[PDB]
Amino acid sequence: MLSLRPYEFWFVTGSQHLYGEEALKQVEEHSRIMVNEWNRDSVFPFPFVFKSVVTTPEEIRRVCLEANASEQCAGVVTWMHTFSPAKMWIGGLLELRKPLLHLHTQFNRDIPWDSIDMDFMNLNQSAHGDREYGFIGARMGVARKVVVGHWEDPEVRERLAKWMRTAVAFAESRNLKVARFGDNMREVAVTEGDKVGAQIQFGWSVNGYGIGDLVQYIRDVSEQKVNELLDEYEELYDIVPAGRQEGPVRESIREQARIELGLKAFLQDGNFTAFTTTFEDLHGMKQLPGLAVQRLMAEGYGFGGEGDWKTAALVRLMKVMADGKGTSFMEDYTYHFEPGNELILGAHMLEVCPTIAATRPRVEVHPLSIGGKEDPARLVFDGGEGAAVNASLIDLGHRFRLIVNEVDAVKPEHDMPKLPVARILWKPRPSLRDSAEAWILAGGAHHTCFSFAVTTEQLQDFAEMAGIECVVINEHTSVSSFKNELKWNEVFWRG
Amino acid sequence: LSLRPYEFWFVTGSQHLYGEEALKQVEEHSRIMVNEWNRDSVFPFPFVFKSVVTTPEEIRRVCLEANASEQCAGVVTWMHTFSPAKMWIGGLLELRKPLLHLHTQFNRDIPWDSIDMDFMNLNQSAHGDREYGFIGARMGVARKVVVGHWEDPEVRERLAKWMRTAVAFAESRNLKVARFGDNMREVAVTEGDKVGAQIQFGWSVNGYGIGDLVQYIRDVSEQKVNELLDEYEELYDIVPAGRQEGPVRESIREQARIELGLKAFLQDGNFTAFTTTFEDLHGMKQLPGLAVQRLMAEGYGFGGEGDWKTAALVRLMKVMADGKGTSFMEDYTYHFEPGNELILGAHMLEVCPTIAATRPRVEVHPLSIGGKEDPARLVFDGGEGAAVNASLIDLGHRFRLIVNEVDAVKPEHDMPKLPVARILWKPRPSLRDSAEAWILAGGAHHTCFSFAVTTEQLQDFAEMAGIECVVINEHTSVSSFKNELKWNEVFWRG
Amino acid sequence: SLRPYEFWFVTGSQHLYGEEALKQVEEHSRIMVNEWNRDSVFPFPFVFKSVVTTPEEIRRVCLEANASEQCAGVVTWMHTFSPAKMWIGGLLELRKPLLHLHTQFNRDIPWDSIDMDFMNLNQSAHGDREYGFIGARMGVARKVVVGHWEDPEVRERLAKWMRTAVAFAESRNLKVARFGDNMREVAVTEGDKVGAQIQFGWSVNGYGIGDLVQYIRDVSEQKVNELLDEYEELYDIVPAGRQEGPVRESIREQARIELGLKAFLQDGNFTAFTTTFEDLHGMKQLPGLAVQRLMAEGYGFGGEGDWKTAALVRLMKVMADGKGTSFMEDYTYHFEPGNELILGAHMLEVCPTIAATRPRVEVHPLSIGGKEDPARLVFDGGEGAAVNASLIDLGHRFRLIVNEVDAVKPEHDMPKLPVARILWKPRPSLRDSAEAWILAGGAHHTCFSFAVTTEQLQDFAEMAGIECVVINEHTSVSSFKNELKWNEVFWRG
């Protein structure tokens, strides 16, 4: 499983000098108390770090600068404990490139009726401090998340926690290194795009390597590690009978083990956390990578087929973002149009991640004429069931668009014994008919990232951080409204 | 404060085509409508019959005349018959007075057994007002549209509300604001472009040294100070100590002196709104407290710490208000108790007693902010009921009006230690959602709170003035409001 | 009064050619920095930064540049091909002024020996073009300079740019104290301080005149007396000013004002300020002599609450090489055919650094403001090529307007004129400059300077992201009108 560096979140509290140093002592006490308490709550997947109360232009600017330079700082949560005149914040906000969350909160929950006096009013006035702050944010057009509520409210904490995962995905995005073995599948439009534009927009480093580079790593893999990995297959998966005995079928599987170790070595050496292949460029390869790619995805690598670096990037980010397991490369393959039981069968010619499997994966070998190589080994299974998202990040030329459809994956009511690939069935919201229409209106790709764990809110928060359109298709979606929103979003996102 | 008499010009459109006799009937109808409208006490200002126009010369002239007439607060136009709209272009180009298109009809019902060609030629607002509607759209003219029979009570109430709004707009274009001192240092939301605002709303905003006001206070007759103090004891409950010749009374007397110096200065230069700033009180004995509260009660606009936008907004809203209860206001602290979320609003001193549920109480207490003597002020609880809380901000290249609908509630508990007037309110549709939407819109901490101004009125003002207005209320969804802000921004740039 | 600002020389290369080649790259860049730092044309020093060749190295040095208060600018050069996607991360991060120097270590092609190793080494010819693309592609604010690194003209362009960049550093940290508001009803000096703070860095805040009165009250009389003595050393005095009597006491009061202002300004780190004759409660005189001396010291000043000009006067003073920079206001014209000119002055506040003659301390009545007869330096402004500049607020954005002028020595004395003044012939003529200036909405308040060039002001605008328009010898009014229009749509948003 791919490891993230330790990330943390900086809690920055604004006030001013006007009220006195004692008032400021109490502001610092309050913010230290909230940071300690939050960090005792297991709801948070990363820790908060307390930062000295900021009360001057230079205190604010310096902590924003420090937030930029710290590789461990994944995000900044800002809260005005008192009025904190926002011209002081301009400098800081200009320097800050780290994800920004404005928490509009209050130390105490209730008003202490019998004792509330003027010092109290001078102290617990987020009711207006955050609004003066809220204005400079709006006036400057800063990318921000706004969260309102009491700091002990578990619902407030839950959305801070989701946001943390999202911001951490953003940090990984900023440092993402993608390796392509070969180019886009020829004549294909949706997988194409502008890598320079994407690096500017998201930070992704996307670069191409000849398949020959990978072949060399596969050749240097030790035969004993191949054997140990093959043993490891026999314990995690069901192997087709023919593959449990010496011969051609077992060899195919051993060859996917060799491909896995080769990919791992190439990837780790370059610090890549996502990659692409293309069946159209497989010189020196025995097989299209299949089982091998499925296993790497289960370890958390991003992947896109046919040189699809956008989806490969998205799969990795969404894996980072996910608060659970079950995130895979995905493609819509065929439809079931039965009235009252409309669903979508999703798969890829080989590469579906076992993390979405309901059942225990079977290693199988089957012919594949696409790519013209030997019968590839792959994991075969039925995807699980439950609420999910299926998302696509496309390139409209001048800008990017992130498109997400909320879906309900369903348990197959029938076996599919002649079907050589892993697969999943889902019912897209609000209906097959409407969702597919809205998707085509938005020009969503056929390649997506499917996840049982990423929420719609996370993807939108990510889109906000990155400065891109995010369009969502779910229960409440009307096709005609959706159509208008694309037009209205159009004009707004130009520039 | 008192308004000059304002009136509303009813202009009726028709054409020569159907003959002179037809035109006499059109005129007879409009005279009947105006005379009967004026008998209806729902209208706060009179209508004036301003002829039936049928030529571009007649239309242009009435529009010129309307601009030049200080009495004329608005023009109501109605096409009784087809009145070809190229004739109206020149007039609509000239017109700078607020415009209401009344889409109406003289008879309520179709007289089935008698309706004939003369009748069809005569009562054809059905298409008259549409052709006129095209030219208004085509020209991007600022306007209010109202549809309905002229005797319908709902039509008349919409008309009545718009009148108040048009009148405030007239006061807007003549507003004088006096600033005693500059903005509070380092504050962003109260800053903004005065030249832009003068162009956009008509507001004159100019700064005076606090010294100029001190001079006026210094020249206040002590005989008048004493009589004003009598009125306080007559109107308010004084703290027991303030009723005997001690130092508590002297503090109340100083506020009285400040009230009179403020009035003298403000009337001298015809100001109807003003700001102070606690960062500049040289030559002053107290931060203007009680005094400001009174001037607000008389309909003055006021803004704390140099806030001229809110000061203006408060005067404008007092003018368009159909009732009592409009104040400068600032959200101070939250009550986050699940199921009873509310906001406590107040200022450090300046809250208008016109929103008070209880008889105001003159108290004196220390206030460290400003470094001056303990100020006298009126203390009370805010009343209950539906209200709006509004803010107007400067985004740099344009202005944005933000209004939250709220429900003010009676406090369930006394606040003994609290030395300022206050009010509690629950924001729609929830405290969490309104605060989020408000922050998304960049709404100020300083607002104008009122029990008597409606969202329709504020929206109509924004229309009259060519600025965005966004409303947060029961039906507001936050994610929709984010989009509404995005899409509006693209429309309003340029 | 400045500080040790410095400029970071960042050199790009790549791992492609091996380590030896990279060592040579590094050795060239250290030499270049050493040699530049041994050339007096440069008003500030360069700093060597180790040759960057990876995305993390580039991003790191940009993060560092941003955090360093002494770093006034980054100078980037691609010694070899240095694949520009590596530079995207750092360029997004960098908020310091950026100059792209397009140069080459060796001046000539060594014909008889040039081989593949030399072609891989000295390939700025294409390294800087690839870097040029990413800059244009991302829309970064930048200055481009082309030529050999030992070419004296390249060095002068680099040096001029250094002063501009330092002005911009000062701008990002500038504080303006306003004693009182804008002169009532005036439009051009109004504006949006929040927008100015976002765009330029300027902090502009208001103090009651009372706060300055208090500082003036707190000044010790020994220092007043010392200062009064300095006036006697530096200026000619009205004879009546030499001995005791009310004229002497008028001058004494300006010293007292100057020392009050100085202490207020130093306590708060204000390097520019404004006053308004419309608010002088507690003062005895409108600040006059006092203001002129503070401008001579390097402070920005603006009359009638004019912060934008106050800031501009300070900024231009910083970027200037030499004395002769002042707050200024067009006062009256000489329309004599063939000898058309403008008399610029202010009611008291003209800076003595533009003086041709020794300033004289004089006391004259002044009814504007309703206070006592103010003491001021009086003199005739010098002659020579200069610029007159205004910064205005169009509502949605700021516009810098610059007229190149030729200051001239007055042919006649002006015995009855109680203020310091200066005469000038604006280019390309009074008729044309005045018209273009009005078409552009130029303020009447300006910063006048003998020492600032047009290119500098254009480079500052470039750094700050605002329009700059120039009126000079080549200006056609009708082309200028078009330019305003075409610039208009470019700058919107």
CSV table of C-alpha atoms in Angstrom, one decimal, chain A residues 158-482:
chain,number,residue,atom,x,y,z
A,158,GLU,CA,-17.2,15.3,10.1
A,159,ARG,CA,-17.0,17.8,7.2
A,160,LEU,CA,-13.6,19.2,8.3
A,161,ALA,CA,-12.4,15.6,8.3
A,162,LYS,CA,-13.7,14.9,4.7
A,163,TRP,CA,-12.1,18.2,3.7
A,164,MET,CA,-8.8,17.1,5.2
A,165,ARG,CA,-8.8,14.1,3.0
A,166,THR,CA,-9.6,16.2,0.0
A,167,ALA,CA,-6.8,18.7,0.7
A,168,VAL,CA,-4.4,15.9,1.2
A,169,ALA,CA,-5.4,14.6,-2.2
A,170,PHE,CA,-4.7,18.1,-3.5
A,171,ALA,CA,-1.1,18.0,-2.0
A,172,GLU,CA,-0.6,14.6,-3.8
A,173,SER,CA,-2.0,16.2,-6.9
A,174,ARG,CA,0.5,19.0,-6.7
A,175,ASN,CA,3.4,16.5,-6.6
A,176,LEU,CA,1.9,13.8,-8.8
A,177,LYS,CA,4.3,12.0,-11.2
A,178,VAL,CA,2.6,10.0,-13.9
A,179,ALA,CA,4.5,7.7,-16.3
A,180,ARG,CA,3.1,6.7,-19.7
A,181,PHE,CA,4.3,3.6,-21.4
A,182,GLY,CA,3.3,4.6,-25.0
A,183,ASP,CA,1.0,7.1,-26.4
A,184,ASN,CA,-2.8,7.6,-26.6
A,185,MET,CA,-4.7,5.0,-28.5
A,186,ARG,CA,-4.8,6.5,-32.0
A,187,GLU,CA,-7.7,8.6,-33.3
A,188,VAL,CA,-9.2,8.8,-29.8
A,189,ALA,CA,-10.4,12.3,-28.7
A,190,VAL,CA,-11.4,12.2,-25.0
A,191,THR,CA,-8.1,10.9,-23.6
A,192,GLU,CA,-6.2,13.6,-25.4
A,193,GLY,CA,-5.5,17.0,-23.8
A,194,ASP,CA,-2.9,19.5,-22.8
A,195,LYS,CA,-0.3,18.2,-20.3
A,196,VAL,CA,1.2,21.7,-19.9
A,197,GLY,CA,-2.3,23.1,-19.1
A,198,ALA,CA,-2.8,20.3,-16.6
A,199,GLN,CA,0.6,20.8,-14.9
A,200,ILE,CA,-0.3,24.4,-14.5
A,201,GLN,CA,-3.8,23.7,-13.3
A,202,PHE,CA,-3.2,20.7,-11.0
A,203,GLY,CA,0.5,20.3,-10.7
A,204,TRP,CA,0.6,16.9,-12.4
A,205,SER,CA,3.9,15.9,-14.0
A,206,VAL,CA,3.0,13.6,-17.0
A,207,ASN,CA,5.8,12.2,-19.1
A,208,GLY,CA,6.2,9.5,-21.7
A,209,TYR,CA,8.5,6.5,-21.7
A,210,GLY,CA,9.0,3.9,-24.4
A,211,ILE,CA,7.6,0.5,-23.6
A,212,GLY,CA,11.2,-0.6,-24.0
A,213,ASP,CA,12.1,1.0,-20.7
A,214,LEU,CA,9.5,-1.1,-19.0
A,215,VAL,CA,10.6,-4.3,-20.8
A,216,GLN,CA,14.2,-3.8,-19.5
A,217,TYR,CA,12.9,-3.7,-15.8
A,218,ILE,CA,10.7,-6.8,-16.4
A,219,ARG,CA,13.8,-8.6,-17.7
A,220,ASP,CA,15.8,-7.6,-14.6
A,221,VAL,CA,13.2,-9.0,-12.2
A,222,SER,CA,14.6,-12.0,-10.2
A,223,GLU,CA,12.9,-15.3,-11.0
A,224,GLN,CA,12.7,-16.1,-7.3
A,225,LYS,CA,10.6,-13.0,-6.5
A,226,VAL,CA,8.4,-14.0,-9.5
A,227,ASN,CA,8.0,-17.4,-7.8
A,228,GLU,CA,7.2,-15.9,-4.4
A,229,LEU,CA,4.6,-13.6,-6.0
A,230,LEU,CA,3.0,-16.5,-7.8
A,231,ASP,CA,2.8,-18.3,-4.4
A,232,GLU,CA,1.1,-15.2,-3.0
A,233,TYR,CA,-1.5,-15.3,-5.8
A,234,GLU,CA,-2.4,-18.8,-4.8
A,235,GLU,CA,-3.2,-17.7,-1.3
A,236,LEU,CA,-5.2,-14.5,-2.0
A,237,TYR,CA,-7.1,-15.6,-5.0
A,238,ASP,CA,-8.8,-18.7,-6.5
A,239,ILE,CA,-6.7,-19.9,-9.5
A,240,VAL,CA,-8.3,-21.6,-12.4
A,241,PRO,CA,-7.5,-25.4,-12.2
A,242,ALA,CA,-5.4,-25.3,-15.4
A,243,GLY,CA,-3.3,-22.6,-13.8
A,244,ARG,CA,-2.6,-24.6,-10.6
A,245,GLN,CA,-0.7,-27.2,-12.6
A,246,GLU,CA,2.4,-26.8,-14.8
A,247,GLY,CA,1.9,-25.8,-18.4
A,248,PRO,CA,1.0,-22.8,-20.7
A,249,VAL,CA,-1.8,-21.4,-18.4
A,250,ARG,CA,0.4,-21.3,-15.4
A,251,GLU,CA,3.1,-19.6,-17.5
A,252,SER,CA,0.7,-16.8,-18.5
A,253,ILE,CA,0.1,-16.1,-14.8
A,254,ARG,CA,3.8,-16.2,-14.0
A,255,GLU,CA,4.4,-13.7,-16.8
A,256,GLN,CA,1.9,-11.3,-15.2
A,257,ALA,CA,3.8,-11.7,-11.9
A,258,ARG,CA,6.9,-10.7,-13.8
A,259,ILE,CA,5.1,-7.6,-15.3
A,260,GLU,CA,3.9,-6.6,-11.8
A,261,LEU,CA,7.5,-6.7,-10.3
A,262,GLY,CA,8.9,-4.9,-13.4
A,263,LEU,CA,6.2,-2.1,-13.1
A,264,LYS,CA,6.7,-1.8,-9.4
A,265,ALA,CA,10.5,-1.4,-9.8
A,266,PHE,CA,10.1,1.2,-12.6
A,267,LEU,CA,7.4,3.1,-10.8
A,268,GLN,CA,9.1,3.2,-7.4
A,269,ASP,CA,12.5,4.1,-9.0
A,270,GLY,CA,10.9,7.2,-10.5
A,271,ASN,CA,8.5,7.9,-7.7
A,272,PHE,CA,5.5,7.5,-9.9
A,273,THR,CA,2.2,6.9,-8.3
A,274,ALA,CA,0.1,6.5,-11.4
A,275,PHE,CA,0.7,5.3,-15.0
A,276,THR,CA,-0.7,4.3,-18.4
A,277,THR,CA,-0.3,1.6,-21.0
A,278,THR,CA,-1.6,1.2,-24.5
A,279,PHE,CA,-2.4,-2.1,-26.2
A,280,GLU,CA,-1.2,-0.5,-29.4
A,281,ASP,CA,2.4,-0.4,-28.2
A,282,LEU,CA,3.5,-3.6,-26.6
A,283,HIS,CA,6.9,-4.5,-28.3
A,284,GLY,CA,8.9,-6.8,-26.2
A,285,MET,CA,5.9,-7.5,-23.9
A,286,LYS,CA,4.5,-11.0,-23.6
A,287,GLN,CA,1.1,-9.7,-22.6
A,288,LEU,CA,-0.9,-6.6,-22.1
A,289,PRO,CA,-0.5,-5.9,-18.4
A,290,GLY,CA,-3.6,-7.2,-16.7
A,291,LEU,CA,-3.4,-9.0,-13.4
A,292,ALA,CA,-0.3,-6.9,-12.9
A,293,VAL,CA,-2.2,-3.6,-13.3
A,294,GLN,CA,-5.1,-4.8,-11.1
A,295,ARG,CA,-2.8,-5.6,-8.3
A,296,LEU,CA,-1.0,-2.2,-8.5
A,297,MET,CA,-4.4,-0.4,-8.5
A,298,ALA,CA,-5.2,-2.4,-5.3
A,299,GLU,CA,-2.0,-0.9,-3.8
A,300,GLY,CA,-3.3,2.5,-4.6
A,301,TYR,CA,-1.7,3.4,-7.9
A,302,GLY,CA,-3.6,5.4,-10.4
A,303,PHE,CA,-4.1,3.9,-13.8
A,304,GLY,CA,-5.7,4.7,-17.2
A,305,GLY,CA,-5.8,2.5,-20.2
A,306,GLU,CA,-5.0,3.5,-23.8
A,307,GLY,CA,-2.6,6.2,-22.5
A,308,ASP,CA,-5.3,8.0,-20.5
A,309,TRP,CA,-3.2,10.1,-18.1
A,310,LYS,CA,-6.2,12.3,-17.0
A,311,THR,CA,-8.1,9.3,-15.7
A,312,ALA,CA,-4.9,7.8,-14.3
A,313,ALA,CA,-4.3,11.0,-12.3
A,314,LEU,CA,-8.0,11.1,-11.2
A,315,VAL,CA,-7.9,7.4,-10.0
A,316,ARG,CA,-4.8,8.2,-7.8
A,317,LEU,CA,-6.3,11.4,-6.3
A,318,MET,CA,-9.6,9.7,-5.7
A,319,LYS,CA,-7.8,6.8,-4.0
A,320,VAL,CA,-6.0,9.3,-1.8
A,321,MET,CA,-9.3,11.2,-1.2
A,322,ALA,CA,-11.2,8.0,-0.3
A,323,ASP,CA,-12.1,7.5,3.4
A,324,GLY,CA,-12.4,3.7,2.7
A,325,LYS,CA,-11.5,1.2,0.0
A,326,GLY,CA,-13.1,0.4,-3.4
A,327,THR,CA,-11.7,2.7,-6.0
A,328,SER,CA,-11.0,1.6,-9.6
A,329,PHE,CA,-10.4,2.6,-13.2
A,330,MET,CA,-13.7,1.9,-15.0
A,331,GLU,CA,-15.4,2.1,-18.4
A,332,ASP,CA,-19.1,1.7,-19.3
A,333,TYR,CA,-19.2,-1.4,-21.4
A,334,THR,CA,-22.8,-2.4,-22.1
A,335,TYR,CA,-26.4,-1.7,-21.1
A,336,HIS,CA,-29.3,-3.6,-19.6
A,337,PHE,CA,-32.4,-1.8,-20.9
A,338,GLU,CA,-35.1,-4.0,-19.1
A,339,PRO,CA,-37.9,-1.6,-18.1
A,340,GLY,CA,-37.7,-1.2,-14.3
A,341,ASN,CA,-34.3,-2.8,-14.1
A,342,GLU,CA,-32.1,-0.6,-16.2
A,343,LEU,CA,-28.4,-0.8,-15.3
A,344,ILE,CA,-24.9,-0.4,-16.6
A,345,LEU,CA,-22.3,-3.1,-16.8
A,346,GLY,CA,-18.9,-1.5,-16.2
A,347,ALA,CA,-15.5,-3.1,-16.9
A,348,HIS,CA,-12.3,-2.8,-18.8
A,349,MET,CA,-10.7,-5.3,-21.2
A,350,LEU,CA,-8.5,-6.4,-18.2
A,351,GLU,CA,-7.9,-3.7,-15.7
A,352,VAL,CA,-10.5,-3.5,-12.9
A,353,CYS,CA,-9.3,-3.1,-9.3
A,354,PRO,CA,-10.0,-6.0,-6.9
A,355,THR,CA,-10.8,-3.5,-4.1
A,356,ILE,CA,-14.4,-3.2,-5.5
A,357,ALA,CA,-14.9,-7.0,-5.6
A,358,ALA,CA,-17.8,-8.4,-3.7
A,359,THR,CA,-16.6,-11.9,-4.2
A,360,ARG,CA,-13.1,-13.5,-3.9
A,361,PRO,CA,-11.2,-12.8,-7.2
A,362,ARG,CA,-10.4,-15.6,-9.5
A,363,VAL,CA,-7.1,-15.6,-11.6
A,364,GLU,CA,-8.1,-16.6,-15.1
A,365,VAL,CA,-6.4,-16.9,-18.5
A,366,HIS,CA,-8.4,-16.0,-21.7
A,367,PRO,CA,-7.5,-15.0,-25.3
A,368,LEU,CA,-7.2,-11.3,-26.2
A,369,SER,CA,-6.8,-10.5,-29.9
A,370,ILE,CA,-6.6,-6.7,-29.1
A,371,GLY,CA,-2.9,-5.9,-28.9
A,372,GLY,CA,-2.0,-9.1,-30.7
A,373,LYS,CA,-0.2,-10.6,-27.7
A,374,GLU,CA,-0.5,-13.8,-25.7
A,375,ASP,CA,-3.6,-14.8,-23.6
A,376,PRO,CA,-3.4,-12.5,-20.6
A,377,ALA,CA,-4.0,-13.5,-17.0
A,378,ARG,CA,-6.4,-11.3,-15.0
A,379,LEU,CA,-8.4,-11.1,-11.8
A,380,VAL,CA,-12.1,-12.0,-12.5
A,381,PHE,CA,-14.8,-11.1,-10.0
A,382,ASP,CA,-18.2,-9.4,-9.5
A,383,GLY,CA,-18.1,-5.8,-8.1
A,384,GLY,CA,-19.8,-5.2,-4.8
A,385,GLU,CA,-23.0,-3.2,-4.2
A,386,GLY,CA,-23.9,0.2,-2.7
A,387,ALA,CA,-23.9,3.9,-3.2
A,388,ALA,CA,-21.0,5.1,-5.3
A,389,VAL,CA,-19.6,7.9,-7.5
A,390,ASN,CA,-18.3,7.6,-11.0
A,391,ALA,CA,-16.2,10.5,-12.2
A,392,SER,CA,-14.5,11.9,-15.3
A,393,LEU,CA,-12.1,14.7,-15.8
A,394,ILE,CA,-12.1,16.0,-19.3
A,395,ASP,CA,-10.3,18.7,-21.3
A,396,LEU,CA,-12.5,21.2,-23.2
A,397,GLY,CA,-9.5,22.8,-24.8
A,398,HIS,CA,-9.3,26.1,-22.9
A,399,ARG,CA,-10.0,24.5,-19.5
A,400,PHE,CA,-10.9,21.3,-17.6
A,401,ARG,CA,-14.2,19.9,-16.5
A,402,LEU,CA,-14.8,17.4,-13.7
A,403,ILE,CA,-18.0,15.4,-14.1
A,404,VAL,CA,-19.5,13.1,-11.4
A,405,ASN,CA,-22.5,10.9,-11.5
A,406,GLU,CA,-23.8,9.4,-8.3
A,407,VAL,CA,-24.7,5.7,-8.8
A,408,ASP,CA,-26.0,2.6,-7.0
A,409,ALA,CA,-24.0,-0.5,-7.7
A,410,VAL,CA,-26.1,-3.6,-7.6
A,411,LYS,CA,-25.4,-7.3,-6.9
A,412,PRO,CA,-25.8,-9.3,-10.2
A,413,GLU,CA,-28.9,-11.5,-10.1
A,414,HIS,CA,-27.3,-13.8,-12.7
A,415,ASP,CA,-23.9,-15.4,-13.3
A,416,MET,CA,-22.0,-14.4,-16.3
A,417,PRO,CA,-19.9,-17.6,-16.9
A,418,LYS,CA,-18.7,-16.8,-20.5
A,419,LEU,CA,-17.5,-13.3,-19.5
A,420,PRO,CA,-13.7,-13.3,-19.2
A,421,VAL,CA,-13.3,-9.9,-17.4
A,422,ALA,CA,-14.1,-8.5,-14.0
A,423,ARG,CA,-17.2,-6.4,-14.0
A,424,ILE,CA,-19.6,-4.3,-11.9
A,425,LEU,CA,-23.3,-3.4,-12.4
A,426,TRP,CA,-24.7,-0.1,-11.4
A,427,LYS,CA,-27.9,1.9,-11.6
A,428,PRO,CA,-27.0,5.5,-12.4
A,429,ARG,CA,-29.0,8.4,-10.8
A,430,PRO,CA,-31.5,9.7,-11.4
A,431,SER,CA,-32.1,7.1,-14.1
A,432,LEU,CA,-30.1,5.4,-16.9
A,433,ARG,CA,-31.8,7.5,-19.5
A,434,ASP,CA,-31.3,10.9,-17.8
A,435,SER,CA,-27.8,10.4,-16.4
A,436,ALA,CA,-26.4,9.2,-19.8
A,437,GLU,CA,-28.0,12.1,-21.5
A,438,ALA,CA,-26.6,14.7,-19.0
A,439,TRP,CA,-23.2,12.9,-19.3
A,440,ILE,CA,-23.1,13.2,-23.1
A,441,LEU,CA,-24.2,16.9,-22.8
A,442,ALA,CA,-21.2,17.5,-20.5
A,443,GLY,CA,-19.0,15.4,-22.9
A,444,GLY,CA,-18.0,13.1,-20.1
A,445,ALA,CA,-15.5,10.4,-21.0
A,446,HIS,CA,-16.1,6.7,-21.3
A,447,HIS,CA,-13.1,6.2,-18.9
A,448,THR,CA,-13.9,7.0,-15.3
A,449,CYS,CA,-12.8,6.5,-11.8
A,450,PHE,CA,-15.4,4.5,-9.8
A,451,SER,CA,-15.4,4.7,-6.0
A,452,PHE,CA,-17.5,3.5,-3.1
A,453,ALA,CA,-15.7,5.9,-0.8
A,454,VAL,CA,-15.4,9.3,-2.4
A,455,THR,CA,-18.3,11.7,-1.7
A,456,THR,CA,-19.7,14.2,-4.2
A,457,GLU,CA,-18.8,17.0,-1.8
A,458,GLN,CA,-15.1,15.9,-1.8
A,459,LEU,CA,-14.9,16.2,-5.6
A,460,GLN,CA,-16.4,19.6,-5.6
A,461,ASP,CA,-14.1,20.7,-2.8
A,462,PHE,CA,-11.2,19.5,-5.0
A,463,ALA,CA,-12.5,21.3,-8.0
A,464,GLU,CA,-12.7,24.5,-5.9
A,465,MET,CA,-9.1,24.1,-4.7
A,466,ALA,CA,-7.9,23.6,-8.3
A,467,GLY,CA,-10.0,26.4,-9.9
A,468,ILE,CA,-12.1,24.2,-12.2
A,469,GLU,CA,-15.7,23.5,-13.1
A,470,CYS,CA,-17.3,20.6,-11.3
A,471,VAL,CA,-20.7,19.3,-12.5
A,472,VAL,CA,-22.7,16.7,-10.6
A,473,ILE,CA,-25.4,14.3,-11.8
A,474,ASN,CA,-27.6,12.7,-9.1
A,475,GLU,CA,-31.1,12.0,-7.8
A,476,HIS,CA,-32.2,15.6,-8.0
A,477,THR,CA,-30.8,16.2,-11.5
A,478,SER,CA,-33.0,17.6,-14.2
A,479,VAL,CA,-31.5,17.3,-17.7
A,480,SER,CA,-32.8,20.7,-18.8
A,481,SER,CA,-31.5,22.5,-15.8
A,482,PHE,CA,-28.2,20.6,-16.2
